[PDB]
Design a protein around this ligand. Structure first.
Ligand SMILES: O=C(c1cc(Cc2n[nH]c(=O)c3ccccc23)ccc1F)N1CCN(C(=O)C2CC2)CC1
Ligand SMILES: [Zn+2]
Length: 200
């Protein structure tokens, strides 16, 4: 499957060297991709496309849809129930929203919790090369995205906007991040099962 090869390439090619020296997500340059599953949840897809059409109509017939990563210990609840802003990241740089990265390694830092939590459930290792990790590769409707550089605790998107784009800056973000404030503005399209690999 070329669809799956495209997802593996997005995963591999978006890895970056993290400022924390791998404290949160581990030390690696690449992954061992074990499985890529397409999520087909008709109810979630209908909620997503219904919202995507509304946002498109409010944004000059353009949804501004992107494929983005999301790492979380709650990936299995997300696949069944969808992203839920009632469980949004309050402590987040851009307030109470649902957060995504365009770099797979940034999302990998959240797979076991904030700052990688205590790592894998079995070895309590944030850099575990044994335990199988899971990330989501999502369809996200950004619509009219508010470009922001510094911390801005929002409860909802700014007036006239459908999302917030956190752009990198000198005394700010190392890498981009994308925030939606409505769970129906993202669809968890692919569930990726993988391992981070020990460097060569
Ligand atoms: O957006 C968050 C969230 C994000 C984060 C940070 C984060 N988590 N994952 C990322 O991939 C990421 C990428 C760039 C910047 C930050 C992140 C932390 C706690 C959170 F609750 N959600 C929590 C998990 N979600 C749910 O619907 C849970 C299942 C009930 C979706 C929304
Ligand atoms: Zn482990």
């Amino acid at each position: 499957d070329k669809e799956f090869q495209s997802v593996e390439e997005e995963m591999q090619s978006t890895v970056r060297e993290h400022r924390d020296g791998g404290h949160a997500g581990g030390i690696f340059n690449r992954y061992n991709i074990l499985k890529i599953q397409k999520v087909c949840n008709k109810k979630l897809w209908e909620r997503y496309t219904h919202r995507r059409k509304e946002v498109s109509e409010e944004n000059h017939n353009h949804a501004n849809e992107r494929m983005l990563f999301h790492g979380s210990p709650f990936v299995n609840a997300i696949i069944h129930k969808g992203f839920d802003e009632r469980h949004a990241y309050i402590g987040g740089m851009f307030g109470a929203g649902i957060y995504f990265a365009e770099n797979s390694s940034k999302s990998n830092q959240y797979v076991y919790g904030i700052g990688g939590g205590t790592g894998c459930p079995v070895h309590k290792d944030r850099s575990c090369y044994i335990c199988h990790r899971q990330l989501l590769f999502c369809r996200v409707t950004l619509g009219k995205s508010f470009l922001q550089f510094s911390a801005m605790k929002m409860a909802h998107s700014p007036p006239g906007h459908h999302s917030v784009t956190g752009r990198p800056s000198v005394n700010g973000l190392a890498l981009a991040e994308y925030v939606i404030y409505r769970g129906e503005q993202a669809y968890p399209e692919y569930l990726i099962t993988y391992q981070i690999m020990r460097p060569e």
